[PDB]
Design goal:
The structure is a homodimer. By secondary structure, chain A is α+β, with helices and mostly antiparallel strands. Chain A is built from twelve helices and 13 strands. In chain A, strands 6, 7, 8, 9, 10, 11, 12 and 13 form an eight-stranded mixed β-sheet that branches. The structure holds flavin mononucleotide (2 copies). It is classed as lyase. Keywords: cAMP, BLUF domain, photoactivation, allostery, lyase.
């Protein structure tokens, strides 16, 4: 069997009516599915454990994930090899701790709340891959390191030092965070993982056979930033927000990397360095998107590739053929590299 | 008043005897201090809330932090402006949920456990600064960005690409993690903050008036790595583990930086770039530790400074005078840059 534990937050205040309406329907649907477990209610927070056949659990959780009466739904635990039920006589016992006033319940209830709100804080500082892994039934702490092929993505804000020199600190952070949010949303939707931010830089990666999605994600970022630039208020620093992007391909190590008290689940390898060095050349090459011939040849769609140059850094003393894609968006975004050379006056006056 | 909530793990199995011995003494000491609250016991895990005068709470928590009967002690919440007690009639009610078998207690107990073990996982992926902030009574999510002077620290493993080419993936990660652990331990003890790992690189920072501690931390890292090298088993990759270190000083932005779902509490600014670019020059300059004249002049101890060169990168078209310190350890560590140029054969045979 499968057992799922999740927490969520009320989307909006819920009445006494609506809460037992939820318990009523859940218990009826679970009874029919031979699913058991507990739904707990505490100060605008839901906790639920559900157990049964994996196929039925998955369809139930799918509806739960779509229910607009709660949000911020987070799976804390997924066990997919359960031999014995934890809550057998109850299709869906609902328990409401708000109305509760039992005696040793009161200390446990404030404990539950403080643990949950502390957990919500830590969630904001946690890589999204960690919660994905947990939702697949895997403890991330026990993943062993592996060699894997990846497409590595690296991007940054053009002339970011000008933003930091000219703007108040709150506006610098607003710009960076806006940029990071655009990139993260598109990368995640295209099947990639944003694994690190460093300075105003984004490091991300895609599966090794997903060069098409990496390229499409890069073009979508450029398109979204175009929308953001031309939709921003007059005088806004967002009007001169441009990105460079570099993609590389290679075998890297994936796993838990860090000190004893603080690790990241992330990647390590030469392709990370190549992607960052290619991204650095966007300015000199007058191309907003640059990638290696290995990325180019690994792609299977008929992108309009343009050869840029043959050069190198490193390290390994090997030359690399560098490509972009030639379309209206990359031409406009590449022109933005030039524009961003002299945005100091524009930024001085926001 | 002040109210503290923390969790901990048993250091070792604790008997029925020892647990009420803890409750017995705690209740007696709290009664004398006019401290109230609750200590909860659940499957080798402690939860406690304590409330009272800040000075008495701090002295009590100090003893709790020293008690070898528990470990992994983590403050989830510190409220330092409490006007009203949450648990007034009880100096230290102790509650043991293991022995408990009440009816709606059972679902809440498995909930408490799953929340706690999920929290413990997330702790391993969380910057240490976040828990420090929480322990000071501050929610990190509501810190506003600020401009602050910092000394920025950047370091990496010399010829790391050779380790990744020659060693099995498990041994590559073991080396990197060992290095990261050495650096983090020393930096934290010297009052700094390790804020990011990228590749085999460590980024950290110290208060702007703490150049002496930054320099001492750097020298201690070099000394610890010497101990690690000369103490490692024969043939071990750790025998050829060397570091470069660069320090820079400047005004940076500190605050929450990232996408909507994932942020870091970290720094942003030119001094980060300068520190990384200085660290990159360690090889060309044949000096394991390099730093800017601003770091040099900001220090107040009589380090044996040696001027290295006048050069630049950037960006800003300004030259920088680069320094090191000349002692036996930096000479030996700098010689290690040369040794690390040709460790491929040594590493091929581990
Ligand atoms: C907090 C919460 C918990 C829920 N738990 C369950 C559940 O355990 N089983 C279930 O069938 N529906 C549960 N639901 C309701 C589903 O989201 C959905 O409303 C219902 O199952 C779909 O019914 P339908 O088959 O007519 O579409 C829950 C809803 C909420 C808000
Ligand atoms: C889980 C746990 C909770 C404790 N809580 C308290 C407490 O609330 N108040 C207290 O005085 N001691 C508490 N202690 C015990 C202290 O660590 C320490 O043993 C004792 O207070 C010191 O007594 P002393 O003044 O003779 O040194 C706790 C110990 C443990 C293991």
């Amino acid at each position: 069997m499968k057992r799922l534990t999740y927490i969520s937050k009320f989307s909006r205040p819920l009445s006494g009516d609506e809460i037992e309406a939820i318990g009523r329907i859940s218990s009826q649907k679970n009874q029919q599915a031979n699913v058991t477990g507990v739904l707990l209610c505490l100060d605008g927070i839901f906790f639920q454990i559900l157990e049964g056949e994996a196929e039925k659990i998955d369809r139930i959780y799918e509806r739960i994930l779509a229910d607009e009466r709660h949000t911020d739904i987070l799976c804390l635990k997924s066990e997919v090899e359960v031999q014995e039920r934890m809550f057998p006589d109850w299709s869906m016992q609902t328990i409401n701790l708000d109305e509760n006033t039992d005696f040793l319940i009161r200390p446990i209830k404030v404990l539950l709340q403080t643990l949950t709100e502390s957990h919500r804080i830590l969630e904001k500082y946690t890589q999204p891959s960690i919660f994905k892994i947990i939702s697949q039934g895997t403890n991330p702490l026990n993943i062993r390191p592996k060699a894997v092929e990846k497409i590595v993505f690296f991007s940054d804000i053009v002339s970011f030092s000008t933003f930091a020199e000219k703007l108040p600190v709150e506006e610098v952070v607003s710009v960076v965070n806006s940029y990071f949010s655009v990139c993260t949303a598109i990368i995640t939707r295209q099947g990639g993982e944003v694994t690190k931010f460093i300075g105003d830089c984004v490091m991300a990666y895609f599966d090794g056979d997903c060069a098409d999605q990496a390229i499409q994600a890069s073009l979508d970022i450029l398109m979204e930033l175009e929308i953001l630039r031309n939709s921003a208020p007059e005088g806004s620093p967002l009007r001169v927000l441009y990105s460079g992007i570099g993609l590389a391909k290679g075998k890297v190590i994936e796993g838990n990397i860090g000190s004893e008290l603080k690790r990241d689940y992330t990647i390590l390898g030469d392709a990370v360095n190549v992607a960052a060095r290619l991204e650095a050349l966007t300015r000199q090459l007058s191309q907003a998107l640059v990638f290696s011939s290995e990325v180019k040849n690994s792609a299977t769609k008929s992108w309009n590739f343009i050869w840029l140059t043959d050069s190198e850094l490193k390290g390994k003393s090997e030359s690399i053929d560098i490509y972009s894609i030639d379309n209206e968006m990359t031409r406009k975004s590449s022109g933005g590299l030039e524009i961003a050379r002299n945005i100091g006056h524009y930024l001085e006056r926001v």
